Design a protein around this nucleic acid. Structure first.
Ligand SMILES: [Zn+2]
Ligand SMILES: [Zn+2]
Lengths: 145, 39, 49, 292
RNA sequence: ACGAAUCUCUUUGCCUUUUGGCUUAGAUCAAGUGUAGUAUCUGUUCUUUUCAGUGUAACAACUAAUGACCUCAGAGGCUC
């Protein structure tokens, strides 16, 4: 304990501090890996001549479409290339499975009563009411069809 | 602005040329010091 | 009275004006850029004159 | 590489004359003077009974890029300083070679980690490329203020009296002193002439030279030395009116003297730099009037 | 309706200062009546100051410093 303290006095803090993933920065790190994976797959599809500008705009459609899936609004872009639209719909459903299964897993925690954070109760409250109304809107369309 | 995505990740090329510190971490203490070999 | 410099905000802060801060020289090629550098140095000293 | 490191570059004249030297290696000793980055400090002593530790001040990367030793930082061949080395190569290749050093701590560390040679370190550490330039050094050896009211001051400068034996004075007036010819060189020439060497112990002579006015004066204690200073000077110049003046004789130069017959002091030559330049301009005519 | 080059112009191509994350859209969406606190101005009080001792006569000190000359290795003497 003191041997780290004294060497911090004499030598200073190391500049190579690498933050481990933690409960507080898991949701951010899940997004950094997700934007990288979508960026890599779309950039291979591109025949040629794609730069830091065109890779910057395409990652918007991903962010917009995740909002549309949360809204249960169908996400259709006119003039969108069908391979890229095939890619973006895939990663949303990847993210949808993590979004839904984390919502199930935390409800089982809350019913047991075993150490759920005060913010996490409100987040799980918000995740379910998306899922319940989404299940409601699916059932309305099946009756209509 | 001031809230941005990443264009590239932090590379390990930069931390390799730094001088080390040699701070002693709790998880780098000696543990499981013997390897097991398969038959 | 000379212009005051902006003070160092940290220890290894860099005066960009004093030196070429990360001089990557052009790679040595085979075409002998000797007289061209003399004409630059003559023109660069002429410009600051 | 921290487990594969070069041996240190030290001169022969830092190590000295003895055969076996016990040297102490400290694996991260002090930090380098040049790149401010740590290294293996080697330190040693010439003999066992010596009283001076000789440390390596710079790292081996800064010592290789300049081709110098780590201890005295002189060049490994020719054993000369770096500023004089890059000047001697400048007279051979007719272009300025120079090792330039960053003032910036991020650009002292940057400039050391590159594997280049700096300045005359391409010429030196190649023995073929160094000996031929010494041969090219050898052919070089085959060549081998009109508005000022100065009239208050020139009354006090003698300028009208003669350098004879007969006046017995302490002070003298040296004019025709170039902007070269340093104050120590005139006291050494007088003390060589009298044999009163190590004069600064007894304070036998005191000399004031301006180097702007191109004039000066030297004061003696014990006036009997004044006849020794007169009699030990043989060559004199007589102005075509008269009024003979002795010549002190610094190498290739000529310095004229007249007994002041009082103590001149400081400020006799001038009390302002702009004012002193006109006294040299005043004299330049009288030197030409004395000679021609 | 085809000139060898300059300027002025139209159309294609190129898009050039041409939307840079995340989560629970990240979260929420303004007083009718009856009384306080802070700032500024205005008024009052207290505090922050010292020496002089009328007139006349007599005596002493001051208006140390500056300039110049000389000796000694800055001081000493003299004059203004
Ligand atoms: Zn160094
Ligand atoms: Zn040396």
């Amino acid at each position: 304990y003191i041997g780290n303290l004294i060497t911090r006095q004499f030598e200073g803090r190391s500049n190579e501090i690498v933050k481990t993933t933690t409960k507080q920065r898991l949701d951010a790190y899940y997004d950094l890996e997700l934007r990288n994976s979508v960026m890599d797959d779309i950039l291979e599809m591109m025949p040629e001549s794609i730069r830091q500008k065109k890779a910057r705009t395409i990652l918007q459609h991903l962010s917009e479409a995740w909002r549309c899936w949360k809204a249960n609004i169908p996400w259709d872009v006119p003039g969108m290339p069908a391979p890229i639209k095939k890619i973006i719909e895939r990663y949303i459903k990847s993210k949808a499975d993590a979004w839904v299964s984390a919502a199930h897993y935390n409800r089982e925690r809350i019913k047991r009563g075993a150490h759920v954070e005060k913010t996490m109760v409100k987040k799980n409250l918000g995740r379910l009411t998306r899922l319940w109304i989404k299940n409601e809107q699916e059932r309305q369309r099946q009756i209509q069809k | 602005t001031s809230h941005r995505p990443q264009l590239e990740a932090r590379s390990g090329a930069k931390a390799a040329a730094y001088t080390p510190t040699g701070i002693e971490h709790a998880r780098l203490l000696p543990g499981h010091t013997t390897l097991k070999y398969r038959k | 009275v000379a212009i005051k410099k902006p003070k160092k905000k940290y220890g290894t802060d860099i005066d960009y004006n004093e030196d070429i801060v990360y001089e990557q020289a052009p790679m040595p090629g085979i075409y002998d850029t000797s007289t061209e550098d003399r004409q630059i140095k003559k023109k660069f000293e002429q410009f600051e004159r | 590489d921290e487990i594969n490191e070069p041996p240190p570059n030290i001169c022969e004249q830092c190590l000295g004359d003895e055969a076996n030297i016990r040297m102490t290696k400290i694996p991260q000793g002090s930090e380098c003077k040049i790149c401010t980055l740590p290294f293996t400090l080697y330190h040693f002593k010439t003999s066992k009974r010596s009283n001076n530790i000789i440390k390596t001040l710079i790292c081996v990367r800064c010592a290789t890029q300049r081709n110098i030793c780590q201890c005295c930082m002189l060049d490994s061949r020719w054993h000369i300083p770096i500023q004089l080395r890059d000047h001697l190569i400048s007279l051979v290749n007719e272009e300025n070679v120079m090792t330039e050093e960053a003032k910036n701590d991020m650009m002292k560390r940057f400039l050391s980690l590159k594997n280049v040679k700096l300045g005359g370190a391409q010429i030196t550490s190649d023995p073929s490329e160094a000996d031929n330039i010494v041969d090219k050094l050898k052919n070089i050896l085959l060549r081998a203020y009109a508005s000022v009211d100065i009239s208050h001051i020139l009354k006090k400068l003698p300028l009208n009296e003669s350098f004879l034996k007969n006046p017995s004075t302490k002070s003298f007036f040296l004019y025709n002193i170039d902007a070269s010819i340093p104050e120590w060189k005139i006291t050494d020439t007088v003390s060589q002439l009298l044999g009163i060497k190590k004069w600064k112990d007894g304070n036998s002579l005191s000399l004031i030279v301006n180097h702007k006015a191109k004039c000066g004066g030297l004061r003696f204690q014990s006036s009997e030395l004044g006849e020794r200073f007169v009699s030990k000077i043989s060559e004199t110049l007589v102005t075509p009116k008269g009024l003979k003046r002795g010549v002190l004789l610094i190498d290739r130069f000529r310095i004229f003297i007249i007994p002041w017959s009082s103590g001149f002091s400081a400020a006799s030559f001038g009390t302002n730099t702009a004012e002193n330049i006109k006294l040299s301009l005043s004299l330049n005519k009288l030197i030409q009037l004395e000679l021609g």
